[PDB]
Design a protein around this ligand. Structure first.
Ligand SMILES: [Mg+2]
Ligand SMILES: [Zn+2]
Ligand SMILES: [Zn+2]
Lengths: 68, 49, 45, 338, 101, 49, 335, 365
């Protein structure tokens, strides 16, 4: 739904590296491996958090029970 | 299909081989004292021990 | 007490007992209840 | 479009024997990994009532807000608002009421309508929440269904964390219950510092012959590194030859065997241990809605949630197959007791 | 003065010193292994071993068994003062390397 | 002494329910029959149950 | 027993440290504090504000595993404990949103707090020197100067993305001057906690106490605290040529070296080796290379969460592992 | 139409979990179901001191009670609505309380597809955390347990005479054999075999930094051991791996356990077809035990655990009673679980790949 704050295994804070990841995907066009490498994460743990993650809250907020 | 027949043979075989016990004279009989076998297995030995 | 919320226009309305449950703005037939204004306690573990 | 709505978690798995609570079909779990959000779920259940219009021109009204000597309100009533319905955000533990329903006690049969004053009688009969752990009220909804009849639908959500008794699959049929939640200072730590998330017994492989699961780690561990989600499709996918080439020039083993430094003793482990990520998934069939017990009398005190669905596996009974087992012991005084 | 932190089990200790056992509450593998290594470096000790009997508790059973003329209530005290000396050696070397660089 | 002690304890004790034991010792291996077609013959000459 | 260890293609030997008086006939290697003071020393590779890398030689795996084990739990830190909600009308549930406020790291010294006594009532456990209070209050509003096209929720929405910077610390109780020099902030304020839409509002208040990492993961002061033994490549039968360049392309590039205009290969900077024993399956390199790792050397690597400097965590861990040893020798042994 | 039928009071049904830190005659019961499953105890001269505190603790504190029955049958007085600690002060000598299920109480334990008489055993209780009926794995083979989220039933007897028959002629320690053939059916299992093959392998040589820990992990601390002189001396003081199983059978001089069996294990190689002793094999093979001392052979499924008449625990059972065999099974079951997690054992993709010669012989043949 949202990116987790800490990674599950060791506990590195990876919640602050999702908007920068999306900014590196669209503009400054790179593949996901190098753009995820020059962002922080070195191990393949804590790299799995940003690589394999679905963003369901952007699809949930289209069904707002508020005014709209 | 084995779960439908998980106990059908052992329950039916349990009907006759139920009230057979060894008495205090080393003879196995039925409930109506009709004797079925004079010594168990021909020698009277416990297969557990 | 702020008891009703429409499911289409989301208009805050509140009617008394036996007052023809519907919306006075659009006419939607189902109504939701707002979150309460009291304090609720949770544990961050 | 399963990749848009997935159901499961990418864990990291050390396939090794550890702590002895993993003998057959049993996984061990990591504390300080399920504390950081691994395997959290929520259960949402619907409770619906209808307010019937009886024959002799009367209704069954909802109401409440009763107090007694500065208790505002009483313990059984502190989840209800002034209307008589449960408000959004509160918690509901045991016998507290979340819908206060009252029916008329004289309008059971049909006394064809007279104008005499008989409508000042209401026998209350609310719904009462019961369960091991408390819940929360998130939605309550009013409806005016087809024949002008009031309808109340309330939803109750409950947050759950993985514990001993909750079962997990492995996307290959390697289902198994949870054995123990192990501390994070345990679980050997592969010098870079990746503590395993779920440790799996390596004896489940020869009796079941799921070697394609072994290709899930090699094509998974070498899929995380160069940022590409791999393909494990049938009669094809990623070849095993060029996925161990991606994994060998990153500084790892070609076969996924990493050397672990042990957790409770600090020394090395005398065999190389196959490590890497596996997509796990949490099922139904938790222990919180299967613990069922009974002391004496009807309406048993530990009642599970009523979701059987053509799965009547006897229950709290003593069948004739179990009667035949105690005859072979010869215990005659247990027959009369049970 | 706490009297529940460490105990001495009844039907495990032999007479007059040698072959004793101890029970420590609120303890994990850390001080168990750290105390098993120091007592093993005593030349008057055969058998020094710890164990956690059940993981959902906070207990540690250690057993100390000696050769002679050294009671196991004294080899525990000797093997625990030396761990303080080790911690005094470690933090003094680490402080001067942060200081001098 | 060991031989006479192991033979004396090996006798079937009185009051044993050995009829009920012999019914469960047969029906319980009966509930694990996979197919396994065999033959009391040569090159598939007969199909025996 | 038979030092620096052997890395085999299917196993690894020489695991046990075994330096006690009773391994052999001669009673070698007693305790001898003056010998351990001479043998043990510490090197330091680098020191950052949130990362430390250093080396310990001539020390057992046991009492250096102990430091790694109680860097995680027994060193205390602060985190959000009790979250009180008002009017949470967003899409995220208030158990999920309370679980994410507990997992942000706080940048304050945990020596300024006292442990909570769990026997007092609910209005007496939390006092001035015990509790750090945070407050989140964000209401989303539609931006009236909308652009020519609906592109992203960053534009055309006022503060639709909340962050960790919106957790405002409140000066509580009476001592509002002790934290006036160093007010507590999160260690990284760009943590996306929630997403909002106009009409939604989050207003809460969080109480933060002190705890150890063994009770819950959120009090762990260090993200990654680990070590590695120093690898070593003993290369005998020194043959050169085209096979020496194939010997280089297996390894990581900066761990052995071909000599430029001179004789055969050698080993330079063996510290950077991640041992994968990839030269033990060729049958060309069978009696010409010997992998191993020295058992007495340790390369401690610590990356903290952001609460404190990683050179403080090791000193505090040595102090904690000392203090539980003198606490035990001053207790009476009750039969 | 011969279905289940009867409905029995004081029973539960919960999933099962692994626990080899528990004895083979015990099943750990959680404190959430050991609060409604009561046991009726009559007060007498020898329980008045305990039952007063048991009534005072109440129904919510676990060492407590839920109901009370008077001697002259006033009513069935529940301990929830009034009638506080003064009610524990009278306690007439014929009163019947209904205490909680406590440690050491006889309880019978069942799995619903009951095939034979080893499907309903009887255990001792032990009060624990999280809500599952966890049990040992030496005892899961007669239940045919393959855990994977399976449920089991639990019944408590409600009288003093049926409780004595569950623990004497129906309990676990008195049912170490199946009656179908006399072979042991309830013995060592899966991870307790491969944890015994790796200790008793010939390439295992231990040391006092390891052997002492091995002896301490099998008897959780408290047990007096007599360390034998080592099999290797003056170069390096080294103890072999067969001196660990030689020691857990007979720890010290106080145990009378002398075991003198010898039989061949699983897959076996003839020595030279000329060497008259059967234990000169190419592998380890034939096992010699003379006076609780293993001279040769590994501890696999045939020698150790479920199988034929030549097991080790079968010999301890026939020679030195059932309690000593139960103690040895507990000792090995909590040795192997601690050792195999700290040695290391994995399979991987490397141990299944043919090494380019089988790919030639498969194309050829
Ligand atoms: Mg199963
Ligand atoms: Zn990580
Ligand atoms: Zn409306």
């Amino acid at each position: 739904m949202i990116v987790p704050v800490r990674c599950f295994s060791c506990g590195k804070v990876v919640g602050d590296k999702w908007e920068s990841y999306l900014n590196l995907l669209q503009e400054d066009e790179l593949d996901e491996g190098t753009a995820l490498s020059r962002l922080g994460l070195k191990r393949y743990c804590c790299r799995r958090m940003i690589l394999t993650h679905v963003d369901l809250i952007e699809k949930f907020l289209r069904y707002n029970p508020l005014e709209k | 299909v084995k779960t439908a027949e998980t106990g059908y043979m052992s329950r039916r075989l349990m009907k006759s081989l139920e009230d057979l016990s060894c008495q205090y004279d080393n003879t196995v009989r039925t409930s109506a004292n009709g004797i079925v076998q004079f010594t168990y297995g021909g020698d009277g030995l416990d297969p557990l021990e | 007490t702020l008891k009703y919320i429409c499911a289409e226009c989301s208009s805050k309305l509140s009617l008394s007992r036996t007052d023809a449950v519907r919306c006075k703005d659009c006419g939607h037939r189902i109504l939701l209840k707002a979150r309460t204004k009291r304090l609720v306690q949770f544990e961050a573990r | 479009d399963y990749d848009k709505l997935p159901a499961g978690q990418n864990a990291t798995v050390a396939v090794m024997s550890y702590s002895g609570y993993d003998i057959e079909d049993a996984l061990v779990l990591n504390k300080s990994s399920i504390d950081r959000g691994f395997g959290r779920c929520e259960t949402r259940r619907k409770t619906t009532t209808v307010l019937k219009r009886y024959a002799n021109h009367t209704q069954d009204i909802i109401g409440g807000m009763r107090v007694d000597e500065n208790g505002d309100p009483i313990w059984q009533h502190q989840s209800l608002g002034p209307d008589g319905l449960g408000e959004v955000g509160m918690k509901v533990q045991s016998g507290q009421i979340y819908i206060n329903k009252s029916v008329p006690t004289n309008s059971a049969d049909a006394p064809n309508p007279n104008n005499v004053n008989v409508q000042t009688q209401y026998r209350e009969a609310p719904v009462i929440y019961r369960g091991p752990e408390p819940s929360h009220i998130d939605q309550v909804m009013m409806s005016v269904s087809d024949n002008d009849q009031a309808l109340i639908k309330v939803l109750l959500r409950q947050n759950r964390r993985p514990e001993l008794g909750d079962k997990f699959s492995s996307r290959h049929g390697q289902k198994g219950v949870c054995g123990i939640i192990v501390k994070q200072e345990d679980m050997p730590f592969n010098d870079q510092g990746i503590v395993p998330d779920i440790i799996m017994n390596p004896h489940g492989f020869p009796s079941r012959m799921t070697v394609g699961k072994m290709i899930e780690l090699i094509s998974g561990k070498a899929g995380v590194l160069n940022g590409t989600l791999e393909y494990g499709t049938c009669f094809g996918g990623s070849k095993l030859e060029d996925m161990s080439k991606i994994l060998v020039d990153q500084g790892f083993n070609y076969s996924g065997k990493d050397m672990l430094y042990s957790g409770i003793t600090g020394e090395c482990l005398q065999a190389y241990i196959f490590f890497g990520p596996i997509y796990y998934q949490k099922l139904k069939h938790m222990v919180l809605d299967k613990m069922h017990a009974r002391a004496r009398g009807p309406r048993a005190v530990l009642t599970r949630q009523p979701t059987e669905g053509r799965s009547r596996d006897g229950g709290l009974r003593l069948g004739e197959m179990e009667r035949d087992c105690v005859i072979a012991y010869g215990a005659s005084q247990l027959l009369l007791e049970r | 003065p706490d009297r529940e932190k460490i105990k001495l089990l009844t039907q495990a200790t032999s007479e007059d010193g040698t072959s004793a056992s101890f029970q420590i509450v609120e303890e994990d593998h850390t001080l168990g292994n750290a105390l098993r290594y120091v007592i093993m470096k005593n030349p008057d000790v055969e058998f020094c071993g710890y164990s956690i009997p059940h993981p959902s508790e906070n207990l540690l059973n250690i057993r100390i068994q000696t050769y002679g003329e050294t009671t196991a209530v004294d080899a525990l005290q000797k093997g625990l003062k030396d761990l303080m000396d080790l911690c005094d050696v470690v933090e003094s070397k680490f402080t001067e390397k942060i200081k001098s660089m | 002494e060991i031989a006479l002690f192991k033979y004396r304890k090996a006798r079937l004790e009185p009051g044993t329910a050995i009829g009920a034991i012999g019914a469960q010792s047969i029906g319980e291996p009966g509930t694990q029959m996979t197919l396994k077609t065999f033959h009391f013959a040569g090159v598939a000459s007969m199909n025996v149950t | 027993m038979s030092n620096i260890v052997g890395i085999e293609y299917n196993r690894v030997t020489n695991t046990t440290s075994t330096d006690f008086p009773g391994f052999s006939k001669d009673a070698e290697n007693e305790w001898n504090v003056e010998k351990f003071k001479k043998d043990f020393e510490v090197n330091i590779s680098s020191l950052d504000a949130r990362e430390a890398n250093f080396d310990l030689i001539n020390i057992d795996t046991s009492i250096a595993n102990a430091f790694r084990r109680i860097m995680i739990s027994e060193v205390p830190s602060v985190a959000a404990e009790y979250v009180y909600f008002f009017n949470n009308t967003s899409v995220i549930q208030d158990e999920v949103l309370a679980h994410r406020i507990g997992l942000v790291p706080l940048k304050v010294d945990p020596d300024m707090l006292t442990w909570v006594d769990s026997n007092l009532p609910d209005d007496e456990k939390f006092t001035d020197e015990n509790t750090i209070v945070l407050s989140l209050n964000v209401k989303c509003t539609r931006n009236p100067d909308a652009p020519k096209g609906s592109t992203d929720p960053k534009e055309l929405y006022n503060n639709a993305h909340v962050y960790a910077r919106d957790l405002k610390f409140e000066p509580q109780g009476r001592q509002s001057t002790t934290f006036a020099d160093c007010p507590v902030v999160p260690a990284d304020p760009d943590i996306l906690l929630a997403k909002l839409r106009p009409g939604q509002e989050i207003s809460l208040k969080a109480h933060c106490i002190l705890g150890i990492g063994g009770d819950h993961a959120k009090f762990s002061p260090v993200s990654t605290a680990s070590y590695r033994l120093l690898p070593q490549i003993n290369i005998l039968q020194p043959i050169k040529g085209e096979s020496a360049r194939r010997f280089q392309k297996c390894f990581p590039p900066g761990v052995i070296g071909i000599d430029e205009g001179s004789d055969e290969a050698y080993v330079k900077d063996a510290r950077k080796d991640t041992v994968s024993r990839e030269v033990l399956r060729y049958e060309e390199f069978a009696d010409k290379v010997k992998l191993g790792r020295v058992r007495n050397h340790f390369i401690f690597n610590v990356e903290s969460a952001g609460a404190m400097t990683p050179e403080e965590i090791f000193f505090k861990s040595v102090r904690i592992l000392k203090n539980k040893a003198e606490y035990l020798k001053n207790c009476p042994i009750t039969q | 139409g011969n279905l289940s039928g009867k409905r029995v009071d004081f029973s539960g049904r919960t999933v099962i979990s692994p626990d080899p830190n528990l004895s083979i005659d015990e099943v750990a019961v959680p404190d959430r179901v050991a609060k409604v499953l009561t046991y009726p105890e009559k007060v007498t001269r020898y329980n008045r001191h305990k039952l007063q505190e048991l009534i005072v603790n109440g129904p919510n504190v676990h060492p407590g009670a839920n109901y009370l029955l008077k001697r002259n049958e006033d009513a069935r007085r529940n301990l929830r609505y009034g009638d506080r600690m003064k009610l524990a002060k009278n306690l007439q000598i014929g009163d019947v309380v209904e205490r909680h299920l406590e440690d050491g109480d006889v309880v019978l334990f069942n799995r619903q597809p009951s095939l034979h008489r080893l499907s309903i055993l009887s255990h001792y209780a032990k009060i624990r955390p999280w809500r599952t009926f966890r049990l040992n794995e030496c005892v899961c083979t007669p239940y045919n347990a393959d855990f994977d989220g399976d449920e089991m039933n639990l019944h408590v007897p409600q009288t003093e005479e049926a409780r004595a028959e569950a623990i004497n002629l129906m309990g676990v320690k008195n049912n170490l054999l199946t009656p179908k053939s006399g072979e042991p059916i309830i013995a060592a299992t899966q991870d307790f075999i491969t944890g015994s093959y790796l200790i008793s392998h010939k390439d295992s040589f231990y040391d006092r930094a390891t052997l002492t820990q091995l002896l301490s992990m099998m008897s959780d601390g408290i047990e007096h051991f007599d360390i034998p002189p080592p099999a290797i001396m003056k170069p390096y003081y080294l103890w072999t791996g067969k001196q660990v199983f030689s020691l857990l059978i007979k720890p010290n001089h106080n145990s009378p356990v002398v075991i003198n069996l010898d039989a061949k294990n699983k897959v076996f190689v003839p020595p030279k077809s000329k060497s008259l002793p059967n234990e000169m094999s190419q592998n380890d093979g034939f096992v010699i035990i003379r006076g609780s001392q293993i001279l040769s052979g590994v501890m696999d499924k045939s020698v150790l655990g479920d199988g034929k008449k030549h097991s080790v625990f079968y010999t301890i059972l026939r020679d030195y009673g059932p309690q000593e065999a139960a103690n040895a099974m507990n000792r090995m079951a909590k040795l192997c679980a601690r050792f195999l997690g700290n040695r290391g054992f994995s399979i991987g993709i490397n141990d299944v790949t043919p090494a380019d010669d089988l790919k030639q012989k498969k194309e050829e043949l």
